[model samples]
Target: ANFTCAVASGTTCKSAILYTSPNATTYGNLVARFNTTTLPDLLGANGLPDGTLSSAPVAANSTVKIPFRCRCNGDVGQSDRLPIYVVQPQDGLDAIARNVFNAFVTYQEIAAANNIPDPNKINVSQTLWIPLPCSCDKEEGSNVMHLAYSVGKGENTSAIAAKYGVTESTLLTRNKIDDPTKLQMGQILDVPLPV
Candidate 1:
């Protein structure tokens, strides 16, 4: 899906996404996952106190907000340069797409972006771009920041809307959801946060 940025020039905007690690990890590990993000970015995004060590542990299944810059190159919006995932041992493109990023991007997109001859031929420690879905466009008539949110199990549209202080209709319209109950786990949604 295309994130159309309704802007005139090459525009960059601050955006964030909620990331849940499948296993316990550390702040240093999370910082290494994204090429353009820093330890301080993670701390500030999750409201962690300053001077928090990079070795601090993040519990499994705990969610953290990852802040990044979303840039509009032409009319399409994506991360300017971020989430550059380094290939780990036993890593596959499909696993990275579905498991790591929660299906926000497809393996095919990553293969194409990286010009890989074969998706299954990636080497260990190879750096790959994980193009997160984002938008810099304003919601309705007001300025807003977009967040790439992965829908959790047992979540409803109304509750998600209320959590962000946005109208249910706006959420439905932005995501083009015909039925609110059809939301699935790991499905990414564009949430417009009022700026």
Candidate 2:
């Protein structure tokens, strides 16, 4: 995820700050000490953990564009890097998670990935990183559209399968769920939709 700054033209923006916490804490270190030129290469090589902005350095005539949201190495390839989601109207972490992954409680995961201090305090039009899981080809399963399903309390495999119009075997097989009794609350199930 490459974040670009939208500063005033000719403003000499210097230094970047990567804060790993919401308030004053031990992890708000300078990801980019001076100038953003070293980013995408140097910074992404390091752990791109989440936090908030303490203060950024901009010229006297310049207003701070704290994050500029630019991040990652190579503007693309970093082992920890994931695709980004530029926030839109009515977009919150939970809603976005439900929309993107179909899981309701994934907002916290999104918050952690983006280092958002307060998921509830997100503003409209803010950029969020959509860091869902990634996988390589599996020899066993066919390509299918999987929905993110959050396991509700007291729900069993059969009940969940019935709710989605799929069989218990289907749900278990699709999600690779081994022990039906071990379905935990808030666990994300990848429900394979019929074609």
Maximum-TM-score candidate: 1
Off by over 4 Å in 1: 117-121
- Largest lDDT belongs to which candidate? 1
Error of 1 at 148 (Å): 0.9
TM-score, structure 1 vs. true: 0.89
lDDT (10s digit) by residue, model 2, range 58-106: 2332212122222223222111333356677776677766644334225
Candidate 1 CA-lDDT value: 0.81
Q: lDDT (0-100) at residue 69 of candidate 1?
A: 85
lDDT scores for all predictions? 0.81, 0.45
Residue 158 lDDT in model 1? 95
